[PDB]
Structures are given as structure tokens and as C-alpha cells.
């Protein structure tokens, strides 16, 4: 089997972005953040506390008659931008562009964080990391991939996120039309529970690449580009005005700059991030300094591949027993 679903960014600046999920018996179809850097299928619902839902699209699982209560069952999640959610899980039949996986964990939320509900456009999550990363208790509970993975004609799924713009998640193929050249595929560690890798290096604009080793994830659900500072600081030098600001929470520019790209490298080869992607708008409405892209890692403790970075590329997320990545340019 296969699946394909388009991915629509939730507003100007590609914050984040919503896929289409069918859950239930009838569907209700919920638009959800597919969130390579976690591992529960969580959704708004009618148990949510009703003054924590603001205009989300609820999961009600007394109308599905495929529903069950998985008894017993909890789950509770923190997010590392501190977000947060908890609640009690049904197994459902869910879908996802045209892949039907029937007994997936669907948690619904009891509470949300207030980010959560303040953001009107996303109706939950479905995470893609590895399923020893899930918070179900006190049984453990598979990602949506990990259910579908054996029926699919190749474990993998693939990220193509757009700039501005719509794009693709495919399960079980990789679409050859939807990239230029090749895939270069690297290294995968699971140990954390994330699609840990390691870049070979970087150069800002023009400059002259950087041999060096940048351990990361790669993380679909985070927005930005989150590296080692030095690497960030070399990148925002050559913005005249760029600077760190301690009161907004990062490097921000003046808006009237041109900014450079940023490449990565994967192997031998070499993913070019361009300018405009790492240009996140004012830091509050009418004013002229913008956000940067690119962030510091430092107070993370890791580093993370973000839709900035993701959406330069097409993405493979090979889920063989050995997992890989692969990245081509598009």
C-alpha cells in the first residue's frame, strides 16, 4: 500500500504545517502537525476541557462506531517549545491520503497547553518519530507509521514541505518526479528516539564550506533551524544590523535586509537554503526588525533540522531495520 497527502502551511510565515487525517467511522477529518520530533497521534476532542478549544476541529469518539476506549489508558506530553497536552486514548481506524491503518492509538486531549489553543488551525498531532518516544501508559502504543510500515511497499515516508506553499507527505514510495538530481542518504541514530544524523558541515552565502560535524534531528514539527551558536553566529555576521536580542528570545535582522543562504551538508552533498527562507517576518506587527531562521541550539541541548531547513530539500525517512535519511534538492 501507499499513501499521499498534501501539507498546507498554516499561515504567511510556514509556522507550522496541517495534513488532512481521516479518524473514525464515519471519517471526521482533523488537520493535523506531522511531527517527526514526537511519537503520539493526539487530537482535540470532545473531552477537551471547553474553554481550552478556540475554533479546532474536535474528534468526538461516541460518534465513530469503530471506536474503543483503550482502557486504562493515559498520556501527558511536553513539548520542548513547552507546550503541552494530556488525556485518555481510543484505537481507531485512521487515514492518511488514502492509507488506512485500523487499531492506531488516538489520544484525546483532556487539556491542552494555552499555545495549543490559542492556534485555531491545528487540530492535533501525528508524530513520526520512533514509537519508544510515545507517552502512552501503561502500555506503550506504535506511531501511525510503525502500524502502517509492513503494509506499505517500502517502509519509508517522505517529507516535502513548500516555501509559501503546499506540499507532500508520501508513505510507502518515493516519488522520483518530486526531486532534482539524487538522494544522498546518511547515518540514522535512534538512541534518543528522534531521526538523529549528522550533517558534514556548512557555509553561509557564498563563503567557503565548513568541514565540520553537526549532530541533529530531523524534526518537521519544529519551525526553525536550531545550531550551535558558533555556526549562528557566523551566519548572522554578514547581515549588517543581525544581532542576538536577549528580550525577544533570539537573532533578529532589520527588515529591510537581503538575507544570504545557508547550506548544510548531507554527505558529500549539499543543501542550499535560501535567504528568504530564514526571514520570519517583524517581531511584532508594524515593527522593523524581523526574526531570524536560524537560532541558537545552545539552551536546547540539541541541535534541530526545522521546516527551515526541511523544506529545502525532499526528505526521506527510511524506516528499515537499519533506519536512514536521504535529502535531495527539488
Partial sequence: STGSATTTP????????????????????????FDTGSSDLWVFSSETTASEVDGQTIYTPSKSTTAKLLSGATWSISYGDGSSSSGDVYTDTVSVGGLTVTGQAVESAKKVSSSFTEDSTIDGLLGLAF????????????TFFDNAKASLDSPVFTA??????????????????????????????????????TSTGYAVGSGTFKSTSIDGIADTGTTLLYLPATVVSAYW????????????GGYV???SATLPSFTFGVGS??????????????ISTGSSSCFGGIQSSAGIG?????????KAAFVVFNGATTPTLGFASK
Fill in 10 to 33: 498554516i499561515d504567511s510565515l510556514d509556522d507550522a504545517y496541517i495534513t488532512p487525517v481521516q479518524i473514525g467511522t464515519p471519517a471526521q477529518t482533523l488537520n493535523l502537525d
Fill in 131 to 142: 514509537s519508544t518516544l510515545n507517552t502512552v501508559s501503561p502500555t506503550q502504543q506504535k
Fill in 160 to 197: 516535502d514541505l513548500g516555501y509559501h506553499a503546499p506540499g507532500t507527505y508520501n508513505f510507502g514510495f518515493i516519488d522520483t518526479t518530486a526531486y532534482t538530481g539524487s538522494i544522498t542518504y546518511t547515518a540514522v541514530s535512534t538512541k534518543q528516539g528522534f531521526w538523529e544524523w
Fill in 237 to 248: 555576521a554578514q547581515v549588517s544590523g543581525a544581532k542576538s536580542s536577549s528580550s525577544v
Fill in 253 to 255: 535582522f532589520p527588515c
Fill in 269 to 282: 552533498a549539499r543543501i542550499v537554503i535560501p535567504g528568504d527562507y530564514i526571514d520570519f517576518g517583524p
Fill in 302 to 310: 540539541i541541535n534541530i533540522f526545522g521546516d527551515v531547513a526541511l
